[PDB]
Write a protein that binds this ligand. Structure first.
Ligand SMILES: Nc1ncnc2c1ncn2[C@@H]1O[C@H](COS(=O)(=O)NC(=O)c2ccccc2[N+](=O)[O-])[C@@H](O)[C@H]1O
Length: 521
């Protein structure tokens, strides 16, 4: 499985310093294979590490019997369910590298992922609108003929993922890919018209988990509510569910971050850490103001907030109104994660997005033409390090633009750095809407909009929104009367995720040739 390797001297350095340990990610789970302590709670169901590890072996073995081989790829679509983890470790034990699509993703995204990786295996959920029946499947399996095996959650027929999980593995020996090879693909937020895959090796990903575990001080006491989409990197590895597993703690799954669901789960299971995006924080604080008892949250000791910028105002309300500590988390699927620390001053936790997890994360600030700016100045975030990728999957064209000659990746973020070394996110350069933490590549939606018979020109831009931070607005130059609901129906027909439908549509007589900078003015 081809990907952009680190130069040999970076690998060597990163091994000498102890960052790359050459262990497979399966070791996160198998070190606890003998443990009957609880690893995952999902509704009424509670799976121990022993059971979780056996479930991954069973599924891996069953897939091996059905002909899946090491070095092949898979497409996985599972929400906040225990079977997400069973599947991730089962594929890791076989040396198969998955994309974990989010439940919210639809045809265009699944098609895009399948087209790039040519999965031999599709695993999905009949609860998803696309898979309750068999029509889409037939089309998907026809148009992506690489697929030989389909397993489905909540299925009673021949393709029931449970039957595979429940079938005891006879004589199963794991064959994880080598540690310096690809373990899995992450999804980028998106800055272009087609989605970009981020290969993650075992060395690089395990280090990001292990080190996030030291910084967040996770242990067997950790009881972690995973309420945001479980397959996103923030939920998975920063320190996420995998850091919880590493530490031997417990992951509590929630379908969504609503107070309605989560306040009760936090009290019931005595949750002590969770991860949210800013709007979920506001909604929580407002639920308390509408009279939810603060005591449901007593056991909470650490609340991470990331995905998008937390305002200082909102941040300060966390210790005050919830009474746990805040940790700001500014990371990216491509790699780099900055954290505020648990012993940082209130000033740094409230007003900054922390600093890199690794001492050899290298971060500088560039001006418009690639030159370093002195500290305090606002510019483009440039970075490289032991867990930051060196290229997107099969993307020579885009890769040429995304990295400088020295291997530094530009995140598209505008930042400034403190005298103390802390980073503050000041804005953005990449053509991306950050809708309450969820990323929308504007070019993707614009291209879809231009396919409408009536749309001549199209621009998608963010607009300030108090709850979500940013909402999306589509500015269109049109031939004929066009209402928002027509645009949304149409985009939905193209088969994209709901959060990607414009919150607002506006027909305008003209747009500048599209020069969005001009448009903002
Ligand atoms: N804390 C933050 N403040 C302002 N912007 C933030 C932020 N955290 C993430 N972002 C933005 O989100 C982009 C990364 O997008 S992402 O691939 O969906 N990943 C994440 O947001 C993320 C957030 C926290 C922890 C881990 C990740 N992650 O690597 O998945 C960054 O380049 C920023 O533009």
């Amino acid at each position: 499985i081809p990907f952009t390797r680190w130069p040999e001297e970076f690998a060597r350095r990163y091994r000498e310093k102890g960052y790359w340990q050459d262990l497979p990610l399966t070791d996160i789970l198998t070190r606890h294979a003998a443990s009957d302590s609880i690893a995952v709670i999902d509704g009424e169901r509670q799976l121990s590490y022993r059971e979780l590890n056996q479930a991954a072996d069973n599924l891996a073995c069953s897939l091996r019997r059905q002909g899946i081989k090491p070095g092949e790829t898979a497409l996985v679509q599972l929400g906040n369910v225990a079977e997400l983890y069973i599947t991730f470790f089962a594929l890791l034990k076989l040396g198969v590298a998955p994309v974990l699509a989010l439940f919210s993703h639809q045809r265009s995204e699944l098609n895009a992922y399948a087209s790039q990786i040519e999965p031999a295996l599709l695993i999905a959920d009949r609860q998803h609108a696309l898979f309750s029946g068999d029509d889409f499947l037939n089309t998907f399996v026809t148009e992506h003929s690489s697929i030989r095996v389909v397993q489905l959650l909540n299925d009673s027929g021949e393709h029931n993922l449970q039957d595979a999980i429940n079938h005891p593995a006879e004589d199963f020996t794991a064959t994880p890919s080598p540690a310096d090879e690809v373990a899995y693909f992450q999804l980028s937020g998106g800055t272009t018209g087609t989605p970009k895959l981020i290969p993650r090796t075992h060395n690089d990903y395990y280090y990001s988990v292990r080190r996030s575990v030291e910084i967040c001080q996770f242990t067997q006491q950790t009881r972690y509510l995973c309420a945001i989409p479980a397959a996103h990197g923030y939920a998975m590895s920063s320190p996420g569910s995998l850091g919880v597993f590493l530490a031997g703690g417990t992951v509590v799954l929630a379908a969504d971050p609503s107070a309605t669901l989560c306040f009760p789960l936090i009290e019931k299971h005595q949750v002590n850490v969770t991860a949210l995006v800013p709007p979920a924080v506001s909604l929580w604080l407002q639920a308390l103001i509408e009279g939810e008892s603060r005591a449901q949250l007593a056991s909470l000791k650490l609340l991470q907030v990331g995905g998008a910028r937390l305002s200082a105002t909102l941040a300060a309300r966390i210790p005050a109104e919830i009474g746990c500590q805040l940790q700001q988390v500014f990371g990216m699927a491509e790699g780099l994660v900055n954290y505020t620390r648990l012993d940082d001053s209130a000033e740094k936790i409230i007003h900054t997005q922390g600093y890199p997890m690794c001492p050899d994360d290298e971060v500088w600030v560039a001006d418009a033409e690639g030159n370093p700016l002195p500290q305090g100045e606002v510019g483009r975030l440039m970075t490289r390090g032991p867990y930051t990728f060196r290229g997107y999957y099969k993307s020579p064209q885009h890769n040429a633009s995304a990295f400088d000659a020295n291997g530094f990746y530009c995140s598209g973020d505008l930042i400034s750095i403190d005298p103390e070394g802390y980073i503050t996110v000041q804005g953005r350069e990449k053509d991306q809407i950050n809708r309450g933490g969820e990323k929308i590549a504007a070019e993707e939606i614009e291209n879809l909009l231009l396919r409408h018979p009536a749309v001549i020109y199209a621009a998608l831009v963010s607009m300030e929104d108090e709850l979500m931070g940013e909402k999306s607005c589509a500015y269109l130059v049109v031939k004929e009367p066009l209402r928002a609901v027509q645009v949304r129906r149409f985009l939905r027909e193209q088969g994209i995720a709901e959060f990607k439908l414009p919150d607002r549509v506006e027909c305008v007589d003209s747009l500048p040739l599209v020069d969005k900078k001009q448009l903002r003015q």
